[PDB]
Write an enzyme that holds these catalytic residues in place. Structure first.
Site, PDB file in Angstrom:
ATOM      1  N   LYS A 186     -15.488  -7.195  -7.567  1.00 19.15           N
ATOM      2  CA  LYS A 186     -14.651  -8.098  -8.353  1.00 19.15           C
ATOM      3  C   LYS A 186     -14.007  -9.154  -7.467  1.00 19.15           C
ATOM      4  CE  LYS A 186     -11.295  -8.073 -12.057  1.00 19.15           C
ATOM      5  NZ  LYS A 186      -9.825  -7.873 -12.170  1.00 19.15           N
ATOM      6  N   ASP A 187     -13.484  -8.736  -6.315  1.00 17.72           N
ATOM      7  CA  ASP A 187     -12.930  -9.686  -5.360  1.00 17.72           C
ATOM      8  C   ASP A 187     -14.020 -10.574  -4.779  1.00 17.72           C
ATOM      9  OD1 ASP A 187     -11.196  -7.432  -5.805  1.00 17.72           O
ATOM     10  OD2 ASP A 187      -9.940  -8.221  -4.196  1.00 17.72           O
TER      11      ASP A 187
ATOM     12  N   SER B  63      -0.122  -1.117  -6.193  1.00 14.82           N
ATOM     13  CA  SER B  63       0.013  -2.343  -6.960  1.00 14.82           C
ATOM     14  C   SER B  63       0.542  -2.054  -8.361  1.00 14.82           C
ATOM     15  CB  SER B  63      -1.325  -3.074  -7.044  1.00 14.82           C
ATOM     16  OG  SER B  63      -2.004  -3.019  -5.805  1.00 14.82           O
TER      17      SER B  63
ATOM     18  N   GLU C  55       2.159 -34.038   0.459  1.00 15.01           N
ATOM     19  CA  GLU C  55       1.064 -33.485  -0.320  1.00 15.01           C
ATOM     20  C   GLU C  55       1.523 -33.088  -1.719  1.00 15.01           C
ATOM     21  OE1 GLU C  55      -1.217 -34.076   3.050  1.00 15.01           O
ATOM     22  OE2 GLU C  55      -1.670 -33.925   0.919  1.00 15.01           O
TER      23      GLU C  55
ATOM     24  N   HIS D  54       0.810  -1.209   0.000  1.00 16.19           N
ATOM     25  CA  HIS D  54       0.000   0.000   0.000  1.00 16.19           C
ATOM     26  C   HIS D  54       0.845   1.262   0.000  1.00 16.19           C
ATOM     27  CE1 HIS D  54      -4.162  -1.625   1.388  1.00 16.19           C
ATOM     28  NE2 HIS D  54      -3.534  -2.511   0.641  1.00 16.19           N
TER      29      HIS D  54
END
Ligand SMILES: CCCCCCCCCCCCCCCCCC(=O)OC[C@H](COP(=O)([O-])OCC(O)COP(=O)([O-])OC[C@@H](COC(=O)CCCCCCCCCCCCCCCCC)OC(=O)CCCCCCCCCCCCCCCCC)OC(=O)CCCCCCCCCCCCCCCCC
Ligand SMILES: CCCCCCCCCCCCCCCCCC(=O)OC[C@H](COP(=O)([O-])OCC(O)COP(=O)([O-])OC[C@@H](COC(=O)CCCCCCCCCCCCCCCCC)OC(=O)CCCCCCCCCCCCCCCCC)OC(=O)CCCCCCCCCCCCCCCCC
Ligand SMILES: CCCCCCCCCCCCCCCCCC(=O)OC[C@H](COP(=O)([O-])OCC[N+](C)(C)C)OC(=O)CCCCCCCCCCCCCCCCC
Ligand SMILES: CCCCCCCCCCCCCCCCCC(=O)OC[C@H](COP(=O)([O-])OCC[N+](C)(C)C)OC(=O)CCCCCCCCCCCCCCCCC
Ligand SMILES: CCCCCCCCCCCCCCCCCC(=O)OC[C@H](COP(=O)(O)OCCN)OC(=O)CCCCCCCCCCCCCCCCC
Ligand SMILES: CCCCCCCCCCCCCCCCCC(=O)OC[C@H](COP(=O)(O)OCCN)OC(=O)CCCCCCCCCCCCCCCCC
Ligand SMILES: CCCCCCCCCCCCCCCCCC(=O)OC[C@H](COP(=O)(O)OCCN)OC(=O)CCCCCCCCCCCCCCCCC
Ligand code: HEC
Ligand code: HEM
Ligand code: HEM
Ligand code: HEM
Lengths: 65, 98, 237, 52, 74, 56, 32, 379, 54, 54
Positions: free
Chosen positions: H227-228, H205, H271, H201
């Site tokens: 959107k998220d 971005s 895994e 921040h």
């Protein structure tokens, strides 16, 4: 009381995959039986004979149950 | 000869589709932002409009139409003299420091 | 090794469920075939009710067995008729007793047996119907048995089930293949009791996903409609 | 980087700071031996080997 | 770093419209599908071959392992 | 235009909007549960402990 | 000049109700 | 009078975080995964709490307690499988996020990149530790192998495996300490994620182009919330598909078996999100070199900011770098597949070659390709 | 809350889980406590503003 | 271990078997006690010197 599985297996015996598998199994049978001491155990072509037979069976059998 | 490979790479790069000159695509490090500040008014305004239009286009995922793409021979390295001057000044300062 | 085929189980469908009548028949098979050597301690008679038996039938089934539990006033472990609270009886008191009883081998817990073997029910079924005669060149030590599906090609368990090995309460023939199918589907139910619910869990969600996805996305596009239709113009002097 | 640190005044700084950093290293080594109770080193030092 | 002094920009004219006056899906399939094919054509030549070589090596490794498990006539 | 009157009568106010959501949630859960369950035993008719309990 | 700019046509995006240049948008605003 | 949104301290922080924070308009879906991770964090932590409410960490009750959760506890199976497949989806999102960071030159945010590497380390440790908790055959045996890998460390290394095990081998003490550390670690992940968000921040971005988007910035709340929301819904679609239709898909069936230390499983494997670095470990013959390669396979992410030499930060305009990146992705898939398979012919040679190609692409092919890239563009 | 029945197996486990989770919430709330404290300063014993002697 | 059948035995094992376990156990208990002492003193300070006006 006969079984559905045995008759389905017998009908699945007579398809060409299992035919070649049975011939290979019989060849190994005579080979190993003839030779006195050999680690060559006909397990693997037996496994292919199975893999053909049980797949053919599983495609049909559950309808007979 | 190599210029054919260079032209093929320019076509396959992508920023020609977005209506961007070459210097619009360079990473903005300290030298680069100082050079951008050093730009004249007209060049800076055209640069910012081009960058904003490109960002719009990639937001919508619509490449700019075929005909008005930045041609290879029409690509002008406007930033290059200022960036060269900035790099030269930085190198001179570092040599003095050493 | 030889792995299992892909038998078309009635519950193998994406939104299909196990046949509960076959669950009940397979549980009868478990009681009267392998409950004398195998333990399913993780399940109890309470799980039986509502999926394969009613409350009264479960109560009668529980009291048909005797479970030793609790210290009395004198402290002795007293035996009482089993109840719905009790889990399934364990045929052997302690595991070492089980191994010493059979051949030294340990009958695995049948509670999670289906969810633990690669292949699931198709494996276990293939094993039960896969009891074969050893091939040429393979010797057999007296006490073991040959099964192609078992890793090691030699199982320490005698052929459990065969024709007329039992008498189903309903009346369906007790032939070996049918018994194997029923016991395998019962073991699938025991391993994954939530199976049916999970399927009913999925279907609603799927229909729900057919309703939230086209909406929210639309809303997103609605909220993007300002930007996606935004138009710009450059007007330098 | 490589060349920009390769200067005369930079090696002058290195020479100036060799003592302090080098004996900071001794500080760290002594602290590590102390904290871990390293018997390989502490055995040789006198009056402390008695703790073992 | 917040709205108000982010950068400097001049002579830029921008328009848009209310979300309540324009369609949310303006010809979602008329140009959406051609756009998808265009992007796919642009990225396919540089995306696929690394995955196809993985496909071939996976198949070859699996088949060779199976063959190795088979007996080798001895 | 049904949507116009619907908005003017029960969508403009956020309070009545929230009442619409809360009230419609009751009946949507009702109808969706019933429809999805009915589909579920339709696909699996006769294999649940709901169509065979009468036998036992 | 400022009078030489005009809003570009958005007819490719406008909803069917608000699309003609001779209907007040208030009538279809409620529906949209 | 002033806005409670940007005058109240908590609300001011939230506003500057994800309400009025400027964001690039051309941010693709590849960034949504970031928020997804946060979601896949919270959806994990909450579920974990509920699991911790019916789990008794002990070698005599761990498997029994997990079984009791699965069967008896009202809607306990859904929580358990939700947890497992949520960890799997968390690793999917983590790998996609790392791929995005590599692709678009997001590692130019050095502080955020390093904090992300630390977060990734902590997540691997948390998942490795958590997989022990059910105390199945695979859990205990894999834990023995992985912890015994630390014996290769010179000098102190052997003592370390006695320290971590809490004794001579993996036993109840190891189980309970793994439970406690598995509890504490995700909150450290949350704090590190807050720091990672702070660092990002500060600078903002990065758009897919790589050019600074300061001229075109949009507020976060009106757009990049819904959107998220859509991204998180899609992630939930996939995750409940996994939970509700193929619950034990990625998990090995051998876990559904009491941990018996008298029987080694047919194949000991971690895994799917661990098989690539475990295959790298397998590839190197030397034990200590194996652990060094294993740790380097993730630590190499920190070197990425230094190895960048192309004048373009992102990869949209570097097709050769795009081909190299996809070769790297295919190599990682090959590593995972090899790690799944046993160490036999030809898996040994394939795993070795892919292991070399991993580092060779990251350290050599990418920078040399970047030099050729700059030379091809007059600069 | 109490697991039905009496204070039994479930109660102990859920009490342990809540006992573990809560102090991290306490840490977050303490951070918020300091955050709210800082812009006001602190209350000196006299109660008067101490902006002339910080 | 949080199981009811072995929680108390686990605590006794902590106090009796673990290296310096009793130190940790009693430090925890008396640290909780001191936490409450300091909390009461802190609330008394806040109420007294008028800090509750924050
Ligand atoms: C595991 C991952 C879990 C999470 C996955 C999703 C995370 C992000 C979700 C949010 C997001 O990024 O939304 C924007 C993202 C891309 O932009 P968009 O919302 O399509 O808006 C128009 C495009 O910018 C440009 O549109 P266009 O010009 O290409 O035309 C419309 C359409 C192509 O037109 C079609 O008709 C689609 C093909 C049929 O384009 C698409 O991308 C359609 C995608 C859905 C089909 O949305 C989607 O991709 C749809 C949802 C995801 C579908 C699966 C994608 C793989
Ligand atoms: C049919 C033949 C094409 C199948 C899709 C593969 C392809 O060529 O995609 C081209 C293209 C992606 O490559 P691109 O346009 O050069 O780069 C777009 C950016 O990655 C930004 O893309 P975006 O976020 O705007 O929307 C697409 C994105 C959205 O991805 C997500 O939301 C995450 C889930 C996928 C990972 O998913 C992908 O790019 C994955 C494509 C392959 C799976 C479908 O995707 C489409 O045209 C439509 C994608 C959705 C189809 C439904
Ligand atoms: C690191 C070097 C110092 C610690 C060390 O090796 O031993 C310290 C002390 C004293 O060790 P020591 O001198 O009794 O024995 C050294 C040899 N080993 C470590 C194999 C037993 O030991 C420890 O602190 C425990 C070993 C792990 C330390 C981390
Ligand atoms: C974990 C992270 C999330 C994972 C899941 C993500 C997907 C699901 C959640 C998000 C779905 C989309 C948004 C849903 C909420 C919404 O529409 O918000 C904006 C909307 C506003 O959208 P709007 O602005 O278009 O409509 C309102 C404006 N007027 C009034 C003019 C029509 O918020 C509301 O409508 C709030 C209404 C009041 C509060 C809720 C009332 C109903 C409560 C029902 C439960 C019982 C109590
Ligand atoms: C892929 C395409 C589908 C995506 C999911 C769609 C969900 C429903 C969306 C909706 O409400 O409407 C979709 C479509 C167009 O909607 P829109 O662009 O807003 O225009 C409305 C006026 N004709 O309108 C319709 O479908 C009809 C609505 C009545
Ligand atoms: C994913 C599959 C789809 C895909 O990658 O499509 C190609 C697409 C193109 O992206 P774009 O930047 O538009 O390319 C311009 C080219 N001139 O996208 C790309 O080329 C970039 C995709 C990679 C970056 C985002 C990360 C996504 C996950 C990739 C796998 C990561 C695995 C772990 C790696 C470590
Ligand atoms: C026993 C509790 C007190 C211990 C300290 C000794 C004492 O009585 O201190 C009184 C002290 C008076 O000093 P002051 O507050 O400056 O007022 C002077 C007015 N001429 O005033 C104080 O010390 C006030 C302290 C208030 C908070 C601590 C005491 C209450 C703790 C439990 C609640
Ligand atoms: C009187 C003894 C006895 C009977 C009856 C018996 N078993 Fe077993 N079973 C064993 C022993 C001993 C082993 C251990 C062999 C291995 O090793 C075993 C092994 C198994 C295995 C392990 C195979 C694997 O590797 O996954 C399964 C599954 C199994 N039995 C299921 C059954 C089922 C189902 C029935 C009947 C419906 C049954 N058994 C009947 C004694 C028995
Ligand atoms: C960072 C997020 C987390 C990850 C990646 C994670 C990972 C895992 C994994 C992989 C398992 C094993 C699942 C299985 O049995 O197959 C597990 C189990 C467990 N986790 Fe977590 N976990 C996370 C957060 C938490 C938190 C915050 C808690 C505590 C509140 C928790 C408590 C547990 C418990 C009690 C178990 C044992 C139950 C079980 O194995 O199903 N987890 N975890
Ligand atoms: C704990 C898991 C993580 C969380 C919750 C998290 C959170 C976030 C979020 C929300 C963003 C903004 C959205 C985005 O850009 O994708 C972000 C950006 C970023 N993260 Fe992470 N992150 C995590 C792990 C990582 C990892 C493993 C790395 C790599 C080492 C990393 C490096 C980055 C970078 C470089 C960015 C900036 C991307 C850009 O600006 O384009 N993060 N992080
Ligand atoms: C979790 C326990 C707590 C922590 C860690 C904590 C932390 C702090 C710290 C470090 C200070 C500054 C030092 C001081 O002025 O005393 C402070 C001030 C303060 N705290 Fe707390 N606190 C806690 C509990 C409480 C409680 C229970 C109250 C009362 C409801 C409270 C109300 C205050 C007030 C009013 C101040 C301002 C004191 C002044 O400036 O005169 N705190 N807190």
């Amino acid at each position: 009381l006969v079984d559905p599985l045995t008759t389905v297996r017998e009908q699945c015996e007579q398809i060409e995959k299992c035919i070649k598998a049975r011939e290979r199994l019989e060849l190994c049978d005579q080979r190993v039986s003839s030779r006195s001491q050999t680690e060559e155990d006909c397990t693997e072509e037996l496994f292919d004979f199975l893999h053909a037979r049980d797949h053919c069976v599983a495609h049909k059998l559950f309808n007979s149950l | 000869w190599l210029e054919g490979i260079r032209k093929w790479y320019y076509n396959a790069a992508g920023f020609n589709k977005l209506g961007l000159m070459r210097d619009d695509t360079i990473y903005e490090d300290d030298d680069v932002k100082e050079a951008i500040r050093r730009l004249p008014e007209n060049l800076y305004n055209d640069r910012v409009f081009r960058i904003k239009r490109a960002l719009d286009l990639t937001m919508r995922q619509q490449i700019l139409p075929k005909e008005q793409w930045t041609k290879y021979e029409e690509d002008k390295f406007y930033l290059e003299p200022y960036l060269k001057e900035v790099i030269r000044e930085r190198k001179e300062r570092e040599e003095w420091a050493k | 090794e030889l792995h299992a085929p892909s038998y078309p189980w009635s519950h193998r469908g994406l939104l299909s469920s196990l046949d509960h009548t076959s669950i009940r028949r397979g549980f009868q098979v478990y009681k009267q075939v392998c409950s004398s050597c195998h333990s399913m301690d993780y399940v109890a008679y309470r799980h039986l009710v509502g999926v394969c038996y009613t409350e009264e039938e479960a109560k009668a089934l529980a009291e048909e067995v005797e479970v030793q539990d609790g210290p009395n006033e004198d402290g002795e472990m007293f035996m009482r008729p089993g109840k719905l609270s009790d889990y399934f009886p364990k045929p052997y008191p302690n595991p070492e007793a089980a191994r010493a009883a059979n051949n030294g081998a340990l009958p695995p817990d049948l509670s999670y047996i289906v969810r633990a073997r690669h292949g699931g029910e198709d494996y276990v079924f293939s094993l039960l119907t896969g009891y074969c005669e050893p091939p040429t060149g393979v010797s057999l030590r007296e006490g073991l048995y040959f099964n192609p599906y078992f890793p090691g090609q030699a199982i320490a368990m005698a052929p459990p089930i065969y024709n007329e090995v039992l008498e189903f309460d309903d009346g369906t023939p007790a032939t070996m293949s049918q018994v194997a199918k029923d016991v395998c589907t019962f073991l699938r139910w025991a391993s994954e009791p939530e199976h049916d619910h999970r399927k009913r869990m999925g279907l609603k969600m799927l229909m729900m996903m057919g309703l939230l996805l086209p909406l929210v996305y639309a809303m997103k596009r609605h909220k993007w409609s300002v930007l996606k239709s935004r138009k710009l113009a450059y007007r330098p002097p | 980087m490589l060349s920009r640190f390769l200067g005369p005044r930079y090696r002058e700084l290195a020479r100036n700071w060799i003592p302090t950093a080098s004996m900071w290293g001794a500080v760290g080594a002594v602290g590590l031996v102390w904290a871990t109770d390293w018997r390989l080193i502490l055995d040789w030092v006198p009056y402390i080997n008695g703790k073992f | 770093r917040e709205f108000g002094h982010l950068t400097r920009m001049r002579h830029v004219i921008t328009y848009s419209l209310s979300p309540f006056e324009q369609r949310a899906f303006p010809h979602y399939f008329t140009k959406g599908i051609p756009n998808v094919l265009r992007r796919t054509r642009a990225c396919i030549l540089r995306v696929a071959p690394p995955f196809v070589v993985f496909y071939l090596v996976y198949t070859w490794g699996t088949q060779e392992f199976e063959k190795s498990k088979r007996k080798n006539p001895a | 235009t049904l949507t116009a009157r619907l908005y003017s009568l029960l969508f403009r106010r956020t309070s009545t909007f929230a009442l619409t959501i809360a009230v419609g949630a009751l009946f949507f859960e009702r109808a969706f549960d019933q429809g999805a369950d009915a589909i579920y035993e339709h696909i699996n008719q006769g294999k649940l402990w709901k169509h065979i309990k009468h036998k036992y | 000049s400022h009078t030489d700019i005009r809003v570009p046509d958005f007819s490719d995006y406008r909803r069917a109700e608000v699309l003609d240049s001779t209907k007040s948008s208030k009538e279809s605003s409620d529906a949209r | 009078m002033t806005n409670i949104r940007k005058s109240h301290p908590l609300m001011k922080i939230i506003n500057n975080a994800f309400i009025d924070l400027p964001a690039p308009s051309n941010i693709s879906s590849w960034w949504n995964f970031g928020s997804l991770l946060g979601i896949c964090l919270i959806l994990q932590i909450l579920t974990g709490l509920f699991l911790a409410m019916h789990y008794t960490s002990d070698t005599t009750t761990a498997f029994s307690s997990v079984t009791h959760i699965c069967r008896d506890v009202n809607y306990g199976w859904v929580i358990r499988y939700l947890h497992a497949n949520g960890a799997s989806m968390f690793f999917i999102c983590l790998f996609i996020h790392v791929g995005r960071g590599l692709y678009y030159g997001s590692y130019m945010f050095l502080e955020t990149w390093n904090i992300g590497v630390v977060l990734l380390f902590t997540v691997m440790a948390t998942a490795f530790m958590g997989y022990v908790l059910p105390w199945g055959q695979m859990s205990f045996w894999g834990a023995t192998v992985i912890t015994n890998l630390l014996s290769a460390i010179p000098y102190i290394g052997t003592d370390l495996v006695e320290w971590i095990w809490g004794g001579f081998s993996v036993d109840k003490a190891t189980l309970t300490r793994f439970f406690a550390f598995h509890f504490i670690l995700p909150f450290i992940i949350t704090a590190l994620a807050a720091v990672h968000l702070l660092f990002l921040h500060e600078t903002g971005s990065n758009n897919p182009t790589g050019i600074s988007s300061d001229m075109d910035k949009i507020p976060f709340h009106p757009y990049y919330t819904i959107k998220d929301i859509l991204g998180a819904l899609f992630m939930m679609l996939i995750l409940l598909i996994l939970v509700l239709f193929s619950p034990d898909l990625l998990g090995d069936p051998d876990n559904y078996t009491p941990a018996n230390p008298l029987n080694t499983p047919p194949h000991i494997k971690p895994e799917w999100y661990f098989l690539f670095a475990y295959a790298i470990l397998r590839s190197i013959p030397n034990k200590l070199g194996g652990v060094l390669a294993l740790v380097a396979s993730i630590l190499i992410l920190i070197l990425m900011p230094m190895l960048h030499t192309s004048k373009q930060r992102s990869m949209m305009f570097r097709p050769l770098s795009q081909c190299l990146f996809w070769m790297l992705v295919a190599d990682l898939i090959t590593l995972t597949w090899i790690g799944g398979q046993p160490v036999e012919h030809p898996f040994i040679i394939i795993g070795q070659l892919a292991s070399i190609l991993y580092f060779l692409i990251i350290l050599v092919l990418m920078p040399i390709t970047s030099i050729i890239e700059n030379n091809l563009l007059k600069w």
